[PDB]
PDB file of C-alpha atoms in Angstrom:
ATOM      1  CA  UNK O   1     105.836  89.603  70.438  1.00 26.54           C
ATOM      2  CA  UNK O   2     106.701  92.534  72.553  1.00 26.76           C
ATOM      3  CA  UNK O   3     105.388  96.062  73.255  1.00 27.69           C
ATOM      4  CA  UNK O   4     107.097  98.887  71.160  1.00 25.67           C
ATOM      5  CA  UNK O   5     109.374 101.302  73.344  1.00 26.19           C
ATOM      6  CA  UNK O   6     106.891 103.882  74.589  1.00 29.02           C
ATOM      7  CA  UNK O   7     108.353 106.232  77.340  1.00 29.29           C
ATOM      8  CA  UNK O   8     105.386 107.167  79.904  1.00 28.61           C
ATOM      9  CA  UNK O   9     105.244 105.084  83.232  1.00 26.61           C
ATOM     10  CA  UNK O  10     107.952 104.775  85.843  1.00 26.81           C
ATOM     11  CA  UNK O  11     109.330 102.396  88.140  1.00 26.86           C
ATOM     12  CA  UNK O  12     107.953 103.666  91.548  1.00 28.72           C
ATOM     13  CA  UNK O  13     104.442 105.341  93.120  1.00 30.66           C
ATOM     14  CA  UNK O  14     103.671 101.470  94.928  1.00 31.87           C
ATOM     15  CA  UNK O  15     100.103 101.156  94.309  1.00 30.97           C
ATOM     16  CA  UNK O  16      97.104  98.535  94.790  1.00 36.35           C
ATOM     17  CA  UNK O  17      95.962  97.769  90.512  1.00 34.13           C
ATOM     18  CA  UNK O  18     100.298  98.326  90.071  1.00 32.01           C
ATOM     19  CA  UNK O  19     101.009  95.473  92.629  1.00 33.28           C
ATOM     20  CA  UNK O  20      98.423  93.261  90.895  1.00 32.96           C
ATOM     21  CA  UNK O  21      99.027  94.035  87.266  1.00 32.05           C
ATOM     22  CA  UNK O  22     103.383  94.110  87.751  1.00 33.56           C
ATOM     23  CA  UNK O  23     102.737  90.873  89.613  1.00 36.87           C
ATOM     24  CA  UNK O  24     101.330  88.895  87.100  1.00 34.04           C
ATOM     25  CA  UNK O  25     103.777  90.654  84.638  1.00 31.82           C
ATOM     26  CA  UNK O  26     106.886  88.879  86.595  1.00 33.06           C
ATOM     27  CA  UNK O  27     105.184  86.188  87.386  1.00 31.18           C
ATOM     28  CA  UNK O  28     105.241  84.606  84.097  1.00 30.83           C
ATOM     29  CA  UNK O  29     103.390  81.611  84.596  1.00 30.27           C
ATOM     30  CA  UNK O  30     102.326  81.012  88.523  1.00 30.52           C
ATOM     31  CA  UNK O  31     104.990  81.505  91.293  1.00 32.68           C
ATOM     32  CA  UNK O  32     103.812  82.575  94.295  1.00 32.64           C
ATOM     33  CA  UNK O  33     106.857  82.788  95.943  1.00 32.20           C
ATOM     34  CA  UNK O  34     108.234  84.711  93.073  1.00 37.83           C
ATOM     35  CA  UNK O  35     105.796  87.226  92.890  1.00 35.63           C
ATOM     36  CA  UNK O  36     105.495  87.591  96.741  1.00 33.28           C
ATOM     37  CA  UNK O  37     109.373  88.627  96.998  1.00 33.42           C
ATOM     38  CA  UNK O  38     110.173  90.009  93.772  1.00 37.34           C
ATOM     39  CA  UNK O  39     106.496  92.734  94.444  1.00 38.19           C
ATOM     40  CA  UNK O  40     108.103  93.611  97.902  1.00 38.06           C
ATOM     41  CA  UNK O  41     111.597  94.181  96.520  1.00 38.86           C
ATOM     42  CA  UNK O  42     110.003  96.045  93.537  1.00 42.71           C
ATOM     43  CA  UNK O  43     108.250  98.349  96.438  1.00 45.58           C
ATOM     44  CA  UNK O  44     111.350  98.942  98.305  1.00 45.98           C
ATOM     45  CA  UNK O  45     113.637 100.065  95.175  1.00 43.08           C
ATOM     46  CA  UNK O  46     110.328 101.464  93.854  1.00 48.45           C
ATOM     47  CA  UNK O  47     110.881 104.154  97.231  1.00 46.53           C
ATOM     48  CA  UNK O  48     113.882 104.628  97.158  1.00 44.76           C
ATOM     49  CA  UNK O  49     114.223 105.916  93.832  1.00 45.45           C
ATOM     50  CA  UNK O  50     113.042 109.463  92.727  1.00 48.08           C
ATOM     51  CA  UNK O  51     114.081 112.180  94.786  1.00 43.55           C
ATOM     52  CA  UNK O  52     112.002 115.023  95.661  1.00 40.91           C
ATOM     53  CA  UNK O  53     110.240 117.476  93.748  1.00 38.04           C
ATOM     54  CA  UNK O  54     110.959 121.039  92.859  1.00 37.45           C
ATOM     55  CA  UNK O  55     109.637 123.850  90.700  1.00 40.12           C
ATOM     56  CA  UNK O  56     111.830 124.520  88.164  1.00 40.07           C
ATOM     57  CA  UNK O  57     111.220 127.074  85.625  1.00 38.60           C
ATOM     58  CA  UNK O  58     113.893 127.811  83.052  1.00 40.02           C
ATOM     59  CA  UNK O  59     112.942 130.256  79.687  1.00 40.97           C
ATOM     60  CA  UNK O  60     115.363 130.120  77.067  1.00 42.40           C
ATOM     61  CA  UNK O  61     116.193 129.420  73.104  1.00 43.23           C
ATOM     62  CA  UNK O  62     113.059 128.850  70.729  1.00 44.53           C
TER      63      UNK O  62
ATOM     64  CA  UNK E   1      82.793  81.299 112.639  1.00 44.53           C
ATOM     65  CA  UNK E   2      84.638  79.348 115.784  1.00 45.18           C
ATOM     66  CA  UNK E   3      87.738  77.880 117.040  1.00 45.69           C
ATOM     67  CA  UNK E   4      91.663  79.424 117.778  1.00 46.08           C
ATOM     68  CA  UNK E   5      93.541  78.919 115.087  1.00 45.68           C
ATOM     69  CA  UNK E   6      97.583  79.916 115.024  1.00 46.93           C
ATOM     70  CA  UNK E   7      98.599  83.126 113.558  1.00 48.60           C
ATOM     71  CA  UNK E   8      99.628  83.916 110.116  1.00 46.30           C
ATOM     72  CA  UNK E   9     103.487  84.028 110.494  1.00 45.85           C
ATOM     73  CA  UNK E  10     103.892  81.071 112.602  1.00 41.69           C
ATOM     74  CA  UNK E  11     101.407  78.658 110.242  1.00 39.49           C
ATOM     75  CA  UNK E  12     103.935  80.117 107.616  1.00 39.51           C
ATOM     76  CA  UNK E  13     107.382  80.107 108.908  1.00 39.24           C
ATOM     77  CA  UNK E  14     106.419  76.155 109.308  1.00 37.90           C
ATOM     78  CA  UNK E  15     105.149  75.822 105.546  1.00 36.85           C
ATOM     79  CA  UNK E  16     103.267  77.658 103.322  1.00 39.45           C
ATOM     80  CA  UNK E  17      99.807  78.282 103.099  1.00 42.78           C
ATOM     81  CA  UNK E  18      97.593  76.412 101.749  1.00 41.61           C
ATOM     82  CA  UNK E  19      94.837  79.890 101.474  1.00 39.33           C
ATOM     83  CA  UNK E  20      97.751  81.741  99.784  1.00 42.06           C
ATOM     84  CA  UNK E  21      99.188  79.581  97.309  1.00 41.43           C
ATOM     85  CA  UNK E  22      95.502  79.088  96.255  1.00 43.11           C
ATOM     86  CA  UNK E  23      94.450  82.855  96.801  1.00 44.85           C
ATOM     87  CA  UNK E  24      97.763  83.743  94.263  1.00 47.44           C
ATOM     88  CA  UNK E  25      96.404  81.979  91.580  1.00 46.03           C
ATOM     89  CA  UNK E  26      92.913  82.805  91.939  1.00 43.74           C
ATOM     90  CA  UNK E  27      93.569  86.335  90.934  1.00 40.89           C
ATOM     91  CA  UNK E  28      96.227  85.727  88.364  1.00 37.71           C
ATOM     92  CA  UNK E  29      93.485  83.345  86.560  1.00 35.77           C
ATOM     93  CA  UNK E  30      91.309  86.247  87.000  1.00 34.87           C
ATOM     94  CA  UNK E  31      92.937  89.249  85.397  1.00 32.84           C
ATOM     95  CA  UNK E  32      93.945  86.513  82.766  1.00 30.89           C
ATOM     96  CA  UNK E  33      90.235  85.403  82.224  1.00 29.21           C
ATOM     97  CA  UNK E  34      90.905  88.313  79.346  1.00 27.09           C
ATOM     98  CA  UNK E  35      93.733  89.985  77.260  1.00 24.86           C
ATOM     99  CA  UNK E  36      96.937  90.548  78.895  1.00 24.41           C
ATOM    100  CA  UNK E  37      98.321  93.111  77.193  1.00 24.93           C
ATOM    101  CA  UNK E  38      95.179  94.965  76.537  1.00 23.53           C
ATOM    102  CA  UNK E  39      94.410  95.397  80.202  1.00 22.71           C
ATOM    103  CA  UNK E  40      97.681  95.681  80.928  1.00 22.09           C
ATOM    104  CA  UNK E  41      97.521  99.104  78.809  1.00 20.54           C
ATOM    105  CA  UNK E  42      94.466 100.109  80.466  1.00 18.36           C
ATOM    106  CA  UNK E  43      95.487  99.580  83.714  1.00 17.57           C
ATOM    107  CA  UNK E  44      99.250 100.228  84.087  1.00 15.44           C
ATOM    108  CA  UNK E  45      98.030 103.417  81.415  1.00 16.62           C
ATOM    109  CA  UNK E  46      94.999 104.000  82.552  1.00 15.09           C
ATOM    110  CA  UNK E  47      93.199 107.592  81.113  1.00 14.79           C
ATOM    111  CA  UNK E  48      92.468 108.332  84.801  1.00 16.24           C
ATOM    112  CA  UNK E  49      88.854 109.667  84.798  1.00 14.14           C
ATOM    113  CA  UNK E  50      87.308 112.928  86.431  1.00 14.82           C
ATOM    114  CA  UNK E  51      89.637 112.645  89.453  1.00 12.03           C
ATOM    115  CA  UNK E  52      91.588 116.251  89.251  1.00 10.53           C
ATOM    116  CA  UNK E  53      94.656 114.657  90.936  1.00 11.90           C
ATOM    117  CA  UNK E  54      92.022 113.327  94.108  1.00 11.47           C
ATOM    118  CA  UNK E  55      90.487 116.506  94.172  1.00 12.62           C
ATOM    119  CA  UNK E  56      94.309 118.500  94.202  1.00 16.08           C
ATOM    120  CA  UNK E  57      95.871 116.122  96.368  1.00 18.05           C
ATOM    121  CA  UNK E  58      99.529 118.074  95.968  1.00 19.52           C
ATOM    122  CA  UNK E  59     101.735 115.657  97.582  1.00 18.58           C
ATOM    123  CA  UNK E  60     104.840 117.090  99.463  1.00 19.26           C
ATOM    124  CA  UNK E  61     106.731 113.843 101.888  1.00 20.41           C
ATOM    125  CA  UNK E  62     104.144 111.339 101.647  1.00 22.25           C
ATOM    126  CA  UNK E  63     106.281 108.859 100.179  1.00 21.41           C
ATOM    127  CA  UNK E  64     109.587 109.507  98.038  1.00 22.51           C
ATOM    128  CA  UNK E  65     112.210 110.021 100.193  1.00 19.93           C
ATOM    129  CA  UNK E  66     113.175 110.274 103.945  1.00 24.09           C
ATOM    130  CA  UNK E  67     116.084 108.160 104.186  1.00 22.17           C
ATOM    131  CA  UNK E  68     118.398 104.190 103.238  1.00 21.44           C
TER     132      UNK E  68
ATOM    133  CA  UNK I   1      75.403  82.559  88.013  1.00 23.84           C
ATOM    134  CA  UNK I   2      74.730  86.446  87.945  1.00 19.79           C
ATOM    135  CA  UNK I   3      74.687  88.133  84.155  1.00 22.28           C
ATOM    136  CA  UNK I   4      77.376  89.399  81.824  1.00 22.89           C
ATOM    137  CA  UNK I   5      76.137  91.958  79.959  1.00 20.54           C
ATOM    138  CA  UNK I   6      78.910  93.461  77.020  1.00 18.34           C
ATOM    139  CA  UNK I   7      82.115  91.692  76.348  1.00 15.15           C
ATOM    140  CA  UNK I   8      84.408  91.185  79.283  1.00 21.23           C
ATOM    141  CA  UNK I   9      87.727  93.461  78.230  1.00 18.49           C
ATOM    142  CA  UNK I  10      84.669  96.305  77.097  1.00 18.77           C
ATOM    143  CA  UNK I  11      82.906  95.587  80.825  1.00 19.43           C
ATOM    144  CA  UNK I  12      86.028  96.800  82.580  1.00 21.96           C
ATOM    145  CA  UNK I  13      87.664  98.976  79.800  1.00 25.20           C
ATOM    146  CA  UNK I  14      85.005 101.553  81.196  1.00 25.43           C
ATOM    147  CA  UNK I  15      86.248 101.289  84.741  1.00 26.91           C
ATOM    148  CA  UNK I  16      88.142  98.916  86.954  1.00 26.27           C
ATOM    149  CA  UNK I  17      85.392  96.655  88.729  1.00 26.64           C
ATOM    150  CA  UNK I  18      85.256  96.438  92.529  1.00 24.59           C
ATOM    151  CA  UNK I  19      85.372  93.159  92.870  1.00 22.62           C
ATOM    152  CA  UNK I  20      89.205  92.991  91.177  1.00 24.37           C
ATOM    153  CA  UNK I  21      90.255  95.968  93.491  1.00 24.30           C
ATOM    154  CA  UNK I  22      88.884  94.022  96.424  1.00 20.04           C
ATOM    155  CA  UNK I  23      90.812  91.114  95.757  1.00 15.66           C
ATOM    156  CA  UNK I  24      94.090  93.071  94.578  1.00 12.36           C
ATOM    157  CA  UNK I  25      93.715  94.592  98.517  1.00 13.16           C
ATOM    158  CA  UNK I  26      93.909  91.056 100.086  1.00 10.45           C
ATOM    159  CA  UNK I  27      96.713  90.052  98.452  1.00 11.62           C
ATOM    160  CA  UNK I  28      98.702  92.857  99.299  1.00  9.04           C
ATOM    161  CA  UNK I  29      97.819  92.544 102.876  1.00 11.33           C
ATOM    162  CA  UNK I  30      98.429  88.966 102.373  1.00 10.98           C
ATOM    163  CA  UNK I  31     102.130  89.356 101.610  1.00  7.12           C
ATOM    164  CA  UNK I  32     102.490  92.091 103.876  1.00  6.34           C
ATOM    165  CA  UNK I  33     101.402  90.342 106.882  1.00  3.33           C
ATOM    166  CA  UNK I  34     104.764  88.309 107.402  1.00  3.20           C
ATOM    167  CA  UNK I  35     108.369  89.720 106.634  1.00  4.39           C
ATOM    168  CA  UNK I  36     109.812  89.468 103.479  1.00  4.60           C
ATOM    169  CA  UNK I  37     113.526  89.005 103.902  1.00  7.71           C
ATOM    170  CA  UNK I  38     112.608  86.099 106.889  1.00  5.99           C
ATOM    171  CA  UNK I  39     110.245  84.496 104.505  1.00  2.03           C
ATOM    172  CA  UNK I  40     112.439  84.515 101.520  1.00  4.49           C
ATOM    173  CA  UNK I  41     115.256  82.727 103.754  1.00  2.95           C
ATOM    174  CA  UNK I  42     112.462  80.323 104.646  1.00  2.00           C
ATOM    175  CA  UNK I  43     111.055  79.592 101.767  1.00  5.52           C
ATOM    176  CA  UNK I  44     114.600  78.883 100.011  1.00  2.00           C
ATOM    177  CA  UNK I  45     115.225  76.674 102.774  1.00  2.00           C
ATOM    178  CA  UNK I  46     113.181  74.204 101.034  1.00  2.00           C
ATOM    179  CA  UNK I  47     114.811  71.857  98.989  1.00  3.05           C
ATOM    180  CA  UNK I  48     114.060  73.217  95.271  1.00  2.00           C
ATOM    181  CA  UNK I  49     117.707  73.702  94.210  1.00  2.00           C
ATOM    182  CA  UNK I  50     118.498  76.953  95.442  1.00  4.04           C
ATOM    183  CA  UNK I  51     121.845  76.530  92.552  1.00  6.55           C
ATOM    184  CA  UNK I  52     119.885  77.530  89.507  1.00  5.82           C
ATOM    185  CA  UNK I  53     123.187  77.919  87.266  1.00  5.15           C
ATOM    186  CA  UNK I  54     124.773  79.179  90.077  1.00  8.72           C
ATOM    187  CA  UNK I  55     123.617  82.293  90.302  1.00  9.23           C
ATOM    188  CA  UNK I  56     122.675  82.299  86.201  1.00  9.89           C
ATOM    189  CA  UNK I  57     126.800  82.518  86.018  1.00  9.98           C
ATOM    190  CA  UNK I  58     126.338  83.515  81.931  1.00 10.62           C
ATOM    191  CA  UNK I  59     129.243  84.641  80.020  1.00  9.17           C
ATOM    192  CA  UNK I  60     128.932  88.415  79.034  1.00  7.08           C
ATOM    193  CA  UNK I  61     131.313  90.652  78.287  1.00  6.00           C
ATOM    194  CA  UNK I  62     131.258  93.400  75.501  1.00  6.27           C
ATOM    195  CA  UNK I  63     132.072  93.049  72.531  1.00  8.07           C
ATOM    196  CA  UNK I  64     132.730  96.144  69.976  1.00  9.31           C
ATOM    197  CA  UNK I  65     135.205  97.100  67.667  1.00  7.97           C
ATOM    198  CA  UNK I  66     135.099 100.318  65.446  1.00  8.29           C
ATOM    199  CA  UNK I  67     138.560 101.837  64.330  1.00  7.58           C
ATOM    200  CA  UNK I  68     140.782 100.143  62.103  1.00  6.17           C
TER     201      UNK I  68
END
């Protein structure tokens, strides 16, 4: 059993109720180590993605 | 409340600790007490109540980019 | 040992409880308060077979064929 493919969330915005809720998600069955590393590299990648924001504000075909 | 323990790093760079090996799976058995998947829903997707964006927080270089 | 009014997954389906928040902070901090790259050198020094397939060294390459 898996969850259909819905498009909404994204990997990045590091965030208190994310960094509990992703860590149990990796963590499978109880690794501590695991889901110590693996949240902090998730973070760091997590930052680095996503550029900047801008306004666009195009206006064209129906 | 008493005594002069070590600090945090050192106790840990020696072996791990006992509080957070414990502490990790105090919360996972928590948030697994219930559904999974259901909470995971509610939480990762949560319907974010009267908040307005923290009262029109419009972020700018908080965190995103900068630089590596 | 305090009440429980309502189902559990309906008693926080209305809002995240404080209590979990609180908990989700520590952690965090927990983590946080020694490196991560130092630690995870550390930690894999422990003998636990750091192998593990070497590397999960599984075969993968394409396969697909659509012509003639």
């Amino acid at each position: 059993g898996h969850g259909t493919g819905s498009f909404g969330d994204r990997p990045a915005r590091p965030t208190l109720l994310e960094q509990v809720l992703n860590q149990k998600r990796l963590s499978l069955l109880r690794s501590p180590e695991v889901v110590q590393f693996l949240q902090k590299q998730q973070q760091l990648l997590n930052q680095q993605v996503l550029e900047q924001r801008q306004q666009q504000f195009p206006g064209t075909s129906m | 409340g008493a005594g002069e323990p070590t600090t945090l790093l050192q106790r840990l760079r020696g072996t791990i600790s006992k509080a957070v090996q414990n502490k990790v799976e105090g919360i996972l058995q928590d948030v697994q007490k219930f559904s999974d998947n259901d909470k995971l829903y509610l939480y990762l997707q949560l319907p974010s109540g009267p908040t307005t964006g923290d009262k029109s927080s419009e972020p700018s270089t908080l965190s995103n980019e900068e630089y590596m």
